[PDB]
Design a protein around this ligand. Structure first.
Ligand SMILES: CCCCCCCCCCCCCCCCCC(=O)OC[C@H](COP(=O)([O-])OCC[N+](C)(C)C)OC(=O)CCCCCCCCCCCCCCCCC
Ligand SMILES: CCCCCCCCCCCCCCCCCC(=O)OC[C@H](COP(=O)([O-])OCC[N+](C)(C)C)OC(=O)CCCCCCCCCCCCCCCCC
Ligand SMILES: *P([O])([O])(=O)O[C]C([C])([C])[C]([O])C(=O)[N][C][C]C(=O)[N][C][C]SC(=O)[C][C][C][C][C][C][C][C][C][C][C][C][C]
Ligand code: FES
Lengths: 172, 116, 51, 100, 39, 144, 146, 112, 99, 120, 63, 64, 148
C-alpha cells in the first residue's frame, strides 16, 4: 500500500533482511515508519454518525498503540505513564463526545491524525504536545504539587474557591 | 623470543585458526582473509630475504593483487546479501539451535496453532 | 571482539605491525607498498561497514 | 447438516435491515469487479491480451489466473489507490508485527 | 459508422523518443518530414 | 521445607546467600493484586511437600529493593533458582502449575552432573552481570 | 456407494470435504477436496499458494498415503508441503510416521507440533471443515524458481 | 538396530543459552499460562483505578466493569503493550469481556 | 483560473451554507490546489473531501484553530514563552497589549 | 622510509599535542558551561534528530570502490617498470604496453555497462 | 509581473475604511510547490541548486 | 551508450522485499538553520544515498 | 435467468475474440508464431522493457537523460466522481459467511455497527461533557510515596 501506514513502510530489522531469512515483517504500528509522510489523504466522507464514531474509535486506537513510543522519545515517561496518557486523551475526547456532524468529525479526525504524526516524528516539542496528555484534575507525576488550596479551602464550594482567589490582579 | 621463521609460520596458521574461530559474519571473514593474505605476503618477503630469491619477493605484489581481487569479490558478495534476505551473521540463516548465540530464537510465522 | 569496527581497527593495527616488522627486517619498500594498498582496502572496508 | 447447490451448508441469512446484510451485498458487488466467486477465488472468463492466463468476467477483469486466490491487499490497493482512513490491522499486519 | 483510425497511447505526447519517431515516420525519413537540421 | 518470610530486602538476600540452597523458590508478593492471598496459601501448602526446595516469601511492598534486584515484573511471582541462578518463573497464581515447574526443575537438577569445584552457589545477579560485561558493556562503550 | 438399479446420481456438493486455510498473507481460503485424494493434490488443484511441493508427492509406489504404510517405503522426499493442522483433526490424525518426522525436523524453516506434510495426508470424511495454516515453505534447489 | 521410536537427531537439538531449564522441543510454540495472563491483565487493569480487582468477574462486560468506549480501547491497547502483540481489527472490535481477551491471548503463540 | 488559449481570467465562486463547510477538492485535477487548498482549509476550516494531502501548511504544531475567521482575534489565544521549570518552550494564555 | 628517529618524532608530535592540551585547559579556566537540556544533544538545524545510531547510507558506488582496488593494484604493478625504464628491452616494453592495454580494456568494459554511475 | 512571477492581490471591500479580505497570491508559493515535483531524483547538491533557481522568498510563501 | 533504465529507477511491488526500500532512509530535515534553506524552511528530506526521494516542506515558520 | 444472460453475453464476447483471432492474415499468423517463440525465451528484464516501451519510457542513454519527463513528470489522472459517490469505503475483506465460526471472529464486527446505530438514533442530541478541572488528590500516590 502506497501510504505512510502501508504494511511495507517498516524499518528493516537488519541491513540485509526485513525480519528473518524465512519471513518478512516490521513495526510501523507502535513506532514510526521507514519513509516520511508525503501525503495524508482525506478521510472518506462518512454519511453516518455511526461511521464517524467508528473513525473516532479507530483514531483513538491508533493513538493508544503509539503512546509508549511518544513517551519514550520525548522523555515524558515520568510525567505520566502510558495508561495515564491514554486516560487523559480519553478525557479530551470525552469533552468532544457531543459532536454530531459526521463531516466535522472527519475534519477533527484528520487534524488529530496530523497532530499524532507531528508528535510521532519529533516535529512538535514535548512541552507543547503534552497538553493533550496532561491530567485535568490531578498534578503531573514528575514534580511536587501544592495542596494548600485543598487544605485551606476545605470542602468549600467552587464559587468560594474562585471568590477568594479572584479573576483579576488586585493592583490594577 | 621466537625466530622469525617460526613466528611467521605459526601466526599464519594462527590467523587461519582465528578465521574459523570467529563467528561466521561474512565481513569479518573477509577481513580475516585479507589478514591471511598479508601474513603470506610477509612470510614470502622473509623467505626471499633469507634465501636471496627475487622470485619470493615477486610474490609480494602478486599476493596483493590476488588479495585485492578476492576483497572486491567479497565486497560484491556482501552487497548481494541484501537482495537475498540473508543475514550477514550466517548463524542466523538456519533454524539449528546453538548455545553460542544468546538470543537465537526462530518461530513459525503464525499467530495460533490450534483453532478451538 | 565481535564489533566489526574494532575487528577492522585491529586488522589495521596488524598491518601496521607487519610493516614495522618488515622495517625492522630492512624491507621498507615492501612496507610502504603494503601500507598504501592495505590502507586503501581498509578505507573501502570502513565504507562497506558504514553501509 | 444439509447443503445447498454449492457444497456450503444451508444456513439462515442475516436480517434484512442489518449492516451485516448490507455489507455482504457490497462485498458481493466488490467481488464482481475482480471476477471473483463467492469463496474469494479468481474464476475463468474471456481471454485478455497481454495478461497471460488472467481472464475477464462480466462486471470486471480478474487480477489472477482462473481458480486462484483473491488478495485483499491487492483489492485495497487497486480500489483505494492511496487512501487509508485508518491503519487497518489485518492478519498480515498482525503477523508482521509478531515476526518483528 | 466506420471504425475510427487507431491512435496509440504513446501518441498525443508533447515530445517523442526514437522509437516513437520510428513508428511515426514509418515509410518516410526525418529529413523527408521535419526537413534538414543544421548545426 | 517451610516458608521463611522476610519484610526486608537486605535480610532476605543475606539469608539466601548464607544458606546457599541448591534449589530455592522465592515468592514475591504485593498488596495490589487480590490473588496474593491464594498465592500465600498455595506457597504454604507446597512448602511442606517439597523438602528439596528452600521456600522464601518476600513482600515487595515492604521490600521494594527486592523487586528491582530479582527482576520482578508482576505479582505474585514464583522464582525457582538452582545454585542461585534462575531456572524458571511463574508470573501468576496456580498451585498445579507451580508444583509442575517445581517437579520439572527438581528432575532436571537431579539429572545434572556439575564438575568438581564448579558446583557452588552464586548470587542472583552474577550471571546477569556476566552477560552484561560480555554484551552490554561493549555495546555501551561503542555507542555512548 | 451401494447404488441400486435405476437410482439417480448423487450431487458432487454432498461429497465435498471443506478445507479452511490460512494463507501466508494471513488470508482465509475455503477449498474443496474429495476422499481418497491427498491434501497436496487438493491444494494444487485449487491453486493454493504457499506450498512449494518440490518432490510433488514423493514416490508413486509404496506411498505414504497407503493404509497401512509399507515398511519398505522411502517416505517423503522433501519438506515443502508443510501445513499446520488445527488441534482436533491433528489429534485425530495420530502420531507421525518416522520418515515423515525425519523430513519435518530436517526443514530449513521452523515447524510446529501440529505440522504435517500435505502429500502424506489422505483426505477423509472426518476432515470436513478442517482448518489448516500454510506459511511459506522453503525452496530447496535451483529449479524451485524455474 | 533401527529404533523408529527414537525420533531424535541433530536437527532436533533444543539446547539454548537463555534457558537454564531446557525447552521440551525446538519449536518455540510455548503459549503463556492462564494464571500468568490473568495476573498481567490484572496489573493492566490496576492501571485503570475505576475498576475493582477484588470482585472482578471475567465474564462480565467491560461496561459493567466500568469501562467506557475509550476505556475499552485504552485497556486493550495496554494489554497489547503488555503482551507485545497486535489484535486484528475484527478481534479488537469483537472483544466483549476479559475472559474472551484471556482466551485469545492463550491461543496466541507470539505473546511475551 | 487563467486560460492561455483565450487569454482570459475566470473566477468561480462556490457558496457554502452547510455548517461543516464541506466541499470537494480539485487537488487531484489541478496540482496548484494542494497547498492552496491546505491554506484554505487550515485558515478557514474548509473540509476538502477527497484531498491528496490534508496536513496543515502554515499553522504551528499541535495547534488546532482557524485564524482567518472574523470570530478569531488577531492576538490569538496562546503565547509561547520559555519555562525554566521545564527548560523548554511552553504555551500559555496570552495577556497582550491593547492600544 | 624513516626509522626509530621517525618513531621518536611521532612521540614528539604527541608531546606537542600535550602542549596544545595544556593550552586548551588553561583556556577552559576562562569560562563556565551551564547545563541545559539540548546543549549536549545532536544538532539537526534547530530540531531534534529522529535517529541516533541507525544513520545508514545507500553505498551506490561499491562498483567504483572495487574498481579502485583493482586499478590501484594494477598501478602498483606498473610502478617497477617505470622506475627502471632506462633498461627496457623488447620483452619489458611489450609487457608494459600489454598491461596498460589490459587496464584500458577493463576500464572501457566498465564504461560500456554503465557501472560507473549511481544506481537506484 | 513581479520578478518571481505573477504576484496577485484579491481585495474584497465592504465599503468601510478597512479591507474585508485581502488575499495574496504569491508566485513563490507555487514555485516552491513544484520543487518536490522537479526535485525528486536529484542529488542533494542538485536539490540545493533547485532551491536557489526557483527564486523563492519565504515571506511570500508563509505570509 | 546502452540502456541503464533499470539502474535508474526502483519501483515497489506489493509485499516484494527486493522491490521495497531495503534500507533505513536518511530522513534528515533541511531545517531552518541551514545556509540553503533561507532560514525559515524545514524541508523534511527523505534521501537514499543523497538522492532526494521524498519531500515534506514544512513552511509557516515565518507565517505571521 | 441472470446466469443464462451472463452466459450469452460471455459467448458473444468470446465469439468476438475468436473472430479477432481466426481472421488473421498469413503474415499476421507468422508474426504471432515469431512472437510466441520469442516469449518462450524472454527474461523478466525483456518483459519489463516491453512494458516500459508501451508506457513510453526511454530506451537509449540520451533519452535516459530525460527519464523524469515520462516516468514521473506526467500527472496522475484524476479519479471519477462515480468513485467519489460510493456507498461505503471500508477495506475489502473476504466474506466469512460459509467459513467456520473460528474464522468469523476475524471479520468486521457488524454487531458494533447495529449497536452504534441504535445508540445514535436514541441519542440524537446530547449535552457537552465537562471534565472538572478542580484540583484533586492523585488517585495513585506512587510518584510521591515511593522510596526506591
Ligand atoms: C610501536 C612502538 C614502536 C617500536 C616498534 C618496534 C620497532 C619498530 C622499528 C624497528 C626499526 O627501527 O627498524 C629499523 C628500520 C630502519 O633501518 P635501520 O637502517 O635503522 O636499521 C637499524 C640499524 N642496525 C640494524 C645496524 C642496528 O626502521 C624503520 O624503517 C622504521 C620505519 C617507521 C615508519 C613509521 C612507523 C610508525 C608506527 C606508529
Ligand atoms: C598552561 C596550562 C595552565 C593551566 C592552569 C590551570 C587551569 C585551570 O585553572 O582550569 C580551571 C579549572 C577550574 O577552575 P575554577 O572552577 O576555579 O574556574 C572558575 C574561574 N572563575 C572563578 C574565574 C570563574 O581548574 C582546575 O581544573 C584545577 C586547576 C589546578 C588546581
Ligand atoms: P462509547 O462506547 O463510549 O459510546 O463510544 C464513544 C464514541 C462513540 C467513540 C464517541 O466518543 C462519541 O460519543 N461520538 C463520536 C466521536 C465524537 O463525536 N467526537 C470525537 C472527536 S475526535 C477528535 O476531536 C480528535 C481530534 C484530535 C484533537 C487533537 C489531538 C490529536 C493528538 C494530539 C496528541 C498526540 C500526541 C500527544
Ligand atoms: S511434496 Fe515433498 S514431502 Fe510432500
Amino acid at each position: 500500500m502506497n501510504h505512510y501506514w502501508g504494511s511495507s513502510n517498516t524499518i528493516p530489522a537488519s541491513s540485509t533482511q526485513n525480519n528473518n531469512y524465512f519471513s518478512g515483517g516490521g513495526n510501523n504500528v507502535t513506532i514510526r515508519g521507514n519513509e516520511i509522510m508525503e501525503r495524508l489523504p482525506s478521510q472518506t466522507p462518512s454519511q453516518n454518525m455511526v461511521q464517524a464514531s467508528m473513525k473516532t474509535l479507530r483514531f483513538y486506537r491508533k493513538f493508544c498503540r503509539l503512546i509508549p513510543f511518544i513517551l519514550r522519545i520525548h522523555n515524558i515517561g515520568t510525567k505520566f505513564t502510558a495508561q495515564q496518557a491514554m486516560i487523559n486523551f480519553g478525557n479530551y475526547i470525552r469533552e468532544r463526545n457531543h459532536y454530531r456532524d459526521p463531516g466535522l468529525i472527519d475534519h477533527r479526525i484528520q487534524l488529530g491524525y496530523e497532530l499524532l504524526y507531528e508528535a510521532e516524528m519529533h516535529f512538535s516539542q514535548h512541552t507543547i504536545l503534552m497538553q493533550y496528555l496532561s491530567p485535568y484534575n490531578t498534578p503531573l507525576s514528575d514534580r511536587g504539587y501544592s495542596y494548600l488550596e485543598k487544605v485551606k479551602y476545605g470542602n468549600k464550594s467552587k464559587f468560594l474557591q474562585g471568590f477568594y482567589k479572584g479573576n483579576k490582579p488586585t493592583e490594577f | 623470543m621466537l625466530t622469525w621463521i617460526s613466528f611467521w609460520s605459526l601466526i599464519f596458521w594462527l590467523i587461519l585458526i582465528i578465521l574459523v574461530l570467529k563467528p561466521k559474519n561474512f565481513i569479518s571473514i573477509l577481513f580475516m582473509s585479507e589478514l591471511t593474505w598479508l601474513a603470506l605476503y610477509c612470510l614470502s618477503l622473509l623467505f626471499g630475504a633469507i634465501y636471496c630469491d627475487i622470485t619470493l619477493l615477486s610474490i609480494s605484489f602478486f599476493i596483493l593483487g590476488v588479495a585485492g581481487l578476492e576483497f572486491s569479490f567479497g565486497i560484491l558478495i556482501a552487497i548481494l546479501y541484501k537482495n537475498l534476505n540473508e543475514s550477514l551473521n550466517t548463524d542466523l540463516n538456519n533454524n539449528n539451535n546453538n548455545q553460542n548465540i544468546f538470543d537465537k530464537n526462530f518461530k513459525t510465522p503464525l499467530e495460533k496453532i490450534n483453532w478451538q | 571482539n565481535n564489533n566489526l569496527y574494532y575487528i577492522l581497527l585491529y586488522i589495521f593495527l596488524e598491518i601496521v605491525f607487519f610493516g614495522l616488522f618488515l622495517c625492522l627486517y630492512q624491507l621498507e619498500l615492501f612496507t610502504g607498498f603494503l601500507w598504501v594498498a592495505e590502507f586503501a582496502i581498509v578505507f573501502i572496508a570502513v565504507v562497506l561497514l558504514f553501509y | 447438516r444439509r447443503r445447498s447447490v454449492d457444497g456450503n451448508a444451508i444456513r439462515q441469512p442475516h436480517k434484512v435491515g442489518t449492516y451485516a446484510a448490507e455489507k455482504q451485498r457490497l462485498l458481493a458487488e466488490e467481488r464482481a469487479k475482480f471476477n471473483v466467486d463467492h469463496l474469494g477465488r479468481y474464476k475463468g472468463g474471456l481471454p485478455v491480451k497481454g495478461k497471460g492466463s488472467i481472464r475477464k468476467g462480466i462486471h470486471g477483469e480478474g487480477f489472477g489466473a482462473p481458480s486462484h486466490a483473491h488478495d485483499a491487499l491487492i483489492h485495497q490497493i487497486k480500489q483505494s489507490k492511496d487512501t487509508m482512513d485508518y491503519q487497518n490491522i489485518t492478519n498480515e499486519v498482525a503477523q508482521n508485527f509478531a515476526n518483528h | 459508422s466506420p471504425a475510427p483510425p487507431t491512435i496509440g497511447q504513446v501518441e498525443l505526447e508533447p515530445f517523442k523518443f526514437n522509437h516513437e519517431r520510428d513508428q511515426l515516420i514509418y515509410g518516410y525519413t526525418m529529413e523527408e518530414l521535419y526537413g534538414k537540421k543544421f548545426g | 521445607s517451610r516458608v521463611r518470610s522476610f519484610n526486608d530486602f537486605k535480610a532476605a538476600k543475606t539469608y539466601i546467600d548464607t544458606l546457599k540452597p541448591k534449589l530455592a523458590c522465592l515468592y514475591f508478593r504485593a498488596d495490589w493484586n487480590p490473588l496474593c492471598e491464594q498465592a500465600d496459601k498455595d506457597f504454604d501448602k507446597l512448602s511442606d511437600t517439597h523438602l528439596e526446595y528452600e521456600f522464601v516469601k518476600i513482600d515487595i511492598d515492604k521490600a521494594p529493593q527486592a523487586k528491582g534486584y530479582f527482576a520482578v515484573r508482576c505479582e505474585p511471582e514464583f522464582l525457582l533458582l538452582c545454585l542461585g541462578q534462575e531456572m524458571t518463573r511463574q508470573t501468576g497464581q496456580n498451585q498445579r502449575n507451580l508444583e509442575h515447574r517445581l517437579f520439572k526443575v527438581q528432575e532436571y537438577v537431579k539429572g545434572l552432573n556439575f564438575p568438581a569445584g564448579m558446583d557452588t552457589y552464586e548470587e542472583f545477579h552474577e550471571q546477569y552481570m556476566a552477560e552484561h560485561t560480555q554484551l552490554d558493556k561493549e555495546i555501551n562503550e561503542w555507542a555512548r | 456407494h451401494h447404488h441400486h438399479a435405476g437410482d439417480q446420481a448423487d450431487r458432487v456438493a454432498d461429497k465435498i470435504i471443506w478445507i479452511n486455510i490460512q494463507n501466508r498473507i494471513g488470508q482465509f481460503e475455503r477449498i474443496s477436496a474429495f476422499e481418497g485424494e491427498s491434501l497436496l493434490e487438493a491444494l494444487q488443484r485449487n491453486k493454493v499458494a504457499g506450498i512449494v511441493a518440490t518432490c510433488e508427492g514423493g514416490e508413486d509406489i509404496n506411498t505414504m498415503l497407503e493404509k497401512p504404510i509399507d515398511p519398505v517405503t522411502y517416505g517423503p522426499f522433501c519438506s515443502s508441503c508443510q501445513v499446520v493442522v488445527s488441534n482436533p483433526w491433528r489429534n485425530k490424525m495420530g502420531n507421525l510416521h518416522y520418515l515423515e518426522e525425519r523430513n519435518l525436523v530436517r526443514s530449513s524453516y521452523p515447524t510446529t507440533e501440529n505440522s504435517r506434510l500435505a502429500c502424506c495426508i489422505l483426505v477423509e470424511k472426518w476432515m470436513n471443515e478442517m482448518i489448516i495454516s500454510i506459511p511459506q515453505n522453503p525452496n530447496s534447489v535451483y529449479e524451485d524458481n524455474m | 538396530f533401527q529404533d523408529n521410536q527414537d525420533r531424535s537427531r541433530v536437527e532436533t537439538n533444543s539446547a539454548t543459552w537463555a534457558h537454564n531449564l531446557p525447552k521440551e522441543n525446538k519449536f518455540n510454540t510455548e503459549t503463556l499460562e492462564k494464571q500468568e495472563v490473568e495476573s498481567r491483565i490484572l496489573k493492566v487493569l490496576s492501571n485503570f483505578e475505576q475498576v475493582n480487582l477484588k470482585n472482578l468477574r471475567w465474564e462480565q462486560n467491560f461496561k459493567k466493569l466500568g469501562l467506557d468506549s475509550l476505556d475499552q480501547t485504552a485497556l486493550l491497547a495496554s494489554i497489547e503493550h503488555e503482551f507485545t502483540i497486535l489484535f486484528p481489527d475484527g478481534v479488537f472490535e469483537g472483544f466483549e469481556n476479559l475472559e474472551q481477551v484471556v482466551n485469545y491471548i492463550l491461543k496466541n503463540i507470539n505473546a511475551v | 483560473y487563467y486560460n492561455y488559449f483565450l487569454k482570459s481570467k475566470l473566477t468561480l465562486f462556490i457558496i457554502l451554507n452547510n455548517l461543516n463547510k464541506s466541499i470537494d477538492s480539485i487537488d487531484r485535477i489541478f496540482a496548484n490546489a494542494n497547498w492552496l487548498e491546505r491554506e484554505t482549509s487550515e485558515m478557514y476550516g474548509i473540509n476538502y473531501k477527497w484531498k491528496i494531502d490534508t496536513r496543515k501548511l502554515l499553522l504551528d504544531y499541535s495547534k488546532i484553530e482557524n485564524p482567518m475567521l472574523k470570530e478569531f482575534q488577531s492576538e490569538g489565544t496562546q503565547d509561547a514563552f520559555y519555562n525554566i521549570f521545564e527548560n523548554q518552550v511552553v504555551v500559555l494564555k496570552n495577556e497582550t497589549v491593547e492600544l | 622510509m624513516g626509522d626509530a628517529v621517525v618513531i621518536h618524532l611521532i612521540q614528539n608530535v604527541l608531546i606537542f599535542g600535550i602542549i596544545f592540551w595544556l593550552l586548551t585547559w588553561g583556556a577552559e579556566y576562562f569560562y563556565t558551561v551551564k547545563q541545559q537540556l539540548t546543549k549536549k544533544q545532536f544538532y539537526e538545524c534547530g530540531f531534534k534528530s529522529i535517529s541516533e545510531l541507525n544513520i545508514q547510507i545507500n553505498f551506490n558506488f561499491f562498483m567504483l570502490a572495487v574498481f579502485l582496488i583493482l586499478y590501484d593494484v594494477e598501478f602498483t604493478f606498473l610502478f617497477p617498470v617505470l622506475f627502471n625504464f632506462s633498461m627496457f628491452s623488447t620483452t619489458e616494453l611489450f609487457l608494459a604496453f600489454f598491461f596498460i592495454f589490459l587496464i584500458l580494456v577493463s576500464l572501457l568494459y566498465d564504461w560500456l555497462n554503465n557501472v560507473l554511475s549511481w544506481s537506484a | 509581473e513581479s520578478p518571481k512571477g505573477e504576484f496577485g492581490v484579491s481585495m474584497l471591500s465592504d465599503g468601510s475604511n478597512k479591507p474585508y479580505k485581502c488575499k495574496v497570491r504569491s508566485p513563490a508559493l507555487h514555485h516552491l510547490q513544484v520543487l518536490p515535483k522537479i526535485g525528486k531524483g536529484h542529488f542533494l547538491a542538485d536539490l540545493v541548486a533547485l532551491v536557489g533557481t526557483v527564486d523563492i522568498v519565504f515571506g511570500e510563501i508563509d505570509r | 551508450m546502452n540502456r541503464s533504465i533499470f539502474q535508474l529507477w526502483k519501483p515497489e511491488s506489493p509485499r516484494s522485499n527486493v522491490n521495497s526500500k531495503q534500507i533505513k532512509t536518511m530522513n534528515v530535515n533541511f531545517g531552518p538553520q541551514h545556509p540553503a534553506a533561507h532560514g525559515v524552511l524545514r524541508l523534511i528530506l527523505q534521501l537514499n544515498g543523497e538522492i532526494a526521494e521524498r519531500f515534506d516542506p514544512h513552511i509557516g515558520l515565518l507565517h505571521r | 435467468r441472470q446466469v443464462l444472460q451472463e452466459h450469452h453475453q460471455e459467448c458473444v464476447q468470446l465469439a468476438r475474440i475468436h473472430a479477432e483471432e481466426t481472421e488473421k492474415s498469413f503474415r499476421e499468423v507468422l508474426n504471432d508464431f515469431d512472437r510466441i517463440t520469442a516469449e518462450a525465451e524472454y527474461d523478466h528484464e525483456s518483459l519489463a522493457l516491453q512494458k516500459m516501451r508501451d508506457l513510453g519510457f526511454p530506451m537509449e542513454g540520451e533519452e535516459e537523460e530525460y527519464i523524469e519527463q515520462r516516468v514521473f513528470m506526467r500527472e496522475q489522472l484524476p479519479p471519477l466522481e462515480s468513485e467519489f459517490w460510493k456507498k461505503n469505503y471500508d477495506p475489502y475483506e473476504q466474506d466469512l459467511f460459509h467459513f467456520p465460526d473460528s474464522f468469523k471472529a476475524y471479520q468486521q464486527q457488524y454487531k458494533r455497527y447495529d449497536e452504534a446505530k441504535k445508540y445514535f438514533e436514541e441519542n440524537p442530541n446530547v449535552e457537552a461533557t465537562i471534565i472538572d478541572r478542580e484540583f484533586k488528590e492523585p488517585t495513585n500516590k506512587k510518584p510521591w510515596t515511593r522510596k526506591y
